[PDB]
Amino acid sequence: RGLFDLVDDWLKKDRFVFVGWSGLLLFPTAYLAAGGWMTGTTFVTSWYTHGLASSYLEGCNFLTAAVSTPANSVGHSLLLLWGPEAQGDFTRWCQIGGLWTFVALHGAFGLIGFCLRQFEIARLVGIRPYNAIAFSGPIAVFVSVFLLYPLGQASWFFAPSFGVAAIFRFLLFLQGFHNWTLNPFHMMGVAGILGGALLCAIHGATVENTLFEDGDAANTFRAFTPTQSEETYSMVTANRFWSQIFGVAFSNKRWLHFFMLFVPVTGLWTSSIGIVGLALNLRAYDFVSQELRAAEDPEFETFYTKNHLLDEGIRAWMAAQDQPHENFVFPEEVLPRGNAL
Amino acid sequence: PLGISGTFNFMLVFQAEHNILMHPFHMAGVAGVFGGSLFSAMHGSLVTSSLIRETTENESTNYGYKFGQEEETYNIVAAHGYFGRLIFQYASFNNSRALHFFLALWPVVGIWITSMGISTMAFNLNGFNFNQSVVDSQGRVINTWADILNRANLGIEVMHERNAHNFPLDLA
Amino acid sequence: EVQFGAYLAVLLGTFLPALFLVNLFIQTEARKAGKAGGQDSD
Amino acid sequence: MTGPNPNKQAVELNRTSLYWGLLLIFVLAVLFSSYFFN
């Protein structure tokens, strides 16, 4: 009837890719985060920001290429193309590291626009919105690492660059400087990721091994029409199996599939709380009862004090080349070496 | 070491001496458990989304499943039409058997491949090494992200077992 | 040297929430024994 | 007073969800104790 109704009926039309209202936020912003990454890893260097090479023009393969974080002198500037740093020039915008905030900002509005996509399709199909709530897990890892972690730090420079090996140094930068593995929020996150991979490997292998005979063929994939009301696997058998192997087992398909949602997602929320606590440098660095004892008793050694000496090697050896803006000129005689290494 | 801090003594010393992160079999199992926790929470949401009304709003959602029943407890056509619009139509498994097989394939193949990464790196066939790989025409070494990753490996290598070594190369 | 307020953190972090979850189970079984009408309802 | 509330309901917790919630508290007590004692 009205003008709003014609636009509402056009976006929600059955077509190849469902656009909806949320596609106006997703499809422009996701196309430019992805294309900003493919351009930045192919053409744009890191020679002026980090003093590296992170492009395909500079000989890096898929692994050692990245879209890199800007300089520490930029601080937390948004680095707009028209801004006071770039001033409209495209070429000087790329050399300062403007594509990285271009990827991260238009990417953050892609994950907004993709989670709104999951509320919109669920309302048209008419289902409960648990996909949009389980996808809030990965939103809490993008925001609290690519956004909330460099905000608490000195600049955008201490953020993960969007490249394969550039994530890998961020894994190593976070052990030596922060002792991230000791943090109980990672420990509750590893329990959800390795726990979530566990549940789909079991529920994959128990459904597929309690199937009913619905055909004479040896292939069991053929014997399932999608619109049938009979269940395709014996729940009573699978309960009787695991009650004797493992001792305790699900007797509820509604509780089972909810539990496959809770376990992976909670590991992304609990691990997201800790990385917000490392923006503020509130790290779980030391057990002081272990540290006061190892100072007074020069014979008491645990595995825990062995990890601190591994972190002095990370804090001293890479920090010269890690942070060229700070100009660490270490002598050879201050770098902690071991015996004969 | 059978412990918790002993595990991270194991992982870091294994990084300096073998470069596991650049090895493509740790790469094929990070994809196994990131993918595994994806398809876990992606399958577990689409079943819980499309549950059929069998309870009231006062009692629990889970009590609409009586144990050992023969009726199907969720509209599988509904969750197929949702994911058939969330990405596109042809990327959706209408077959629930082939769906519940792909949940068992992806992690297990990802951990078979990974556990044969530790095995092939037990015999000192390490991961990739792109240190000093990018040079200018003059021949000076241009750093990459692998050179920054190398300086993190050199810090752990010169500090692990700080008294056990006597000779310049950690052969063990 | 350990913090002596951590004994109060842990042993009340165990007992107070765990004794809470016991209570919701005991009154659950009492309502089921309450309706059932035999030998235990009273 | 006034009349009885028609919004009175009952709370349930089966034997299954007891052992989840007990094990949830003890494992969080095992995990976070070492940091609290410092």
């Binding site: 009573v236 001792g247 007797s251 009862s289 | - | 042993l11 | 034997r15 052992y19 095992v30 104790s33 004692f37």
Partner: peptide
């Protein structure tokens, strides 16, 4: 004195594992 709490948390965790396996609410059809 400090390790006495850690031991009580560990064997106390293994108690509720014992009761969950053997005293489980046995599911029944009908």
């Amino acid at each position: 004195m400090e390790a006495l709490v850690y031991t009580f948390l560990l064997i106390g965790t293994l108690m509720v594992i014992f009761f969950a396996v053997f005293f489980r609410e046995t599911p029944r059809i009908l």
